[PDB]
PDB file of C-alpha atoms and ligand atoms in Angstrom:
ATOM      1  CA  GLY A   1       9.197 -10.165   5.755  1.00  0.00           C
ATOM      2  CA  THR A   2      12.204  -9.843   8.285  1.00  0.00           C
ATOM      3  CA  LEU A   3      14.570  -7.230   8.928  1.00  0.00           C
ATOM      4  CA  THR A   4      17.577  -9.563   8.473  1.00  0.00           C
ATOM      5  CA  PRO A   5      19.858  -9.823   5.338  1.00  0.00           C
ATOM      6  CA  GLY A   6      18.966 -12.872   2.895  1.00  0.00           C
ATOM      7  CA  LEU A   7      16.703 -13.995   0.456  1.00  0.00           C
ATOM      8  CA  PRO A   8      13.929 -11.788  -0.899  1.00  0.00           C
ATOM      9  CA  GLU A   9      10.422 -12.513   0.833  1.00  0.00           C
ATOM     10  CA  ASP A  10       7.812 -13.540  -1.764  1.00  0.00           C
ATOM     11  CA  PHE A  11       5.030 -11.429  -0.611  1.00  0.00           C
ATOM     12  CA  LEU A  12       6.242  -8.702   1.842  1.00  0.00           C
ATOM     13  CA  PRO A  13       9.644  -6.640   1.392  1.00  0.00           C
ATOM     14  CA  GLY A  14      12.340  -7.496   3.806  1.00  0.00           C
ATOM     15  CA  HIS A  15      14.552 -10.515   3.478  1.00  0.00           C
ATOM     16  CA  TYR A  16      15.134 -13.822   5.329  1.00  0.00           C
ATOM     17  CA  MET A  17      17.790 -16.107   6.210  1.00  0.00           C
ATOM     18  CA  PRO A  18      16.845 -20.130   5.522  1.00  0.00           C
ATOM     19  CA  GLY A  19      17.060 -22.412   8.207  1.00  0.00           C
TER      20      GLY A  19
HETATM   21 CL1   CL B 101      15.451  -7.086  -2.442  1.00  0.00          CL
END
């Protein structure tokens, strides 16, 4: 659910950085 690199999100495309 974000534009950043990181882990895939559960329910939306895009990724997130934990923390
Ligand atoms: Cl992915």
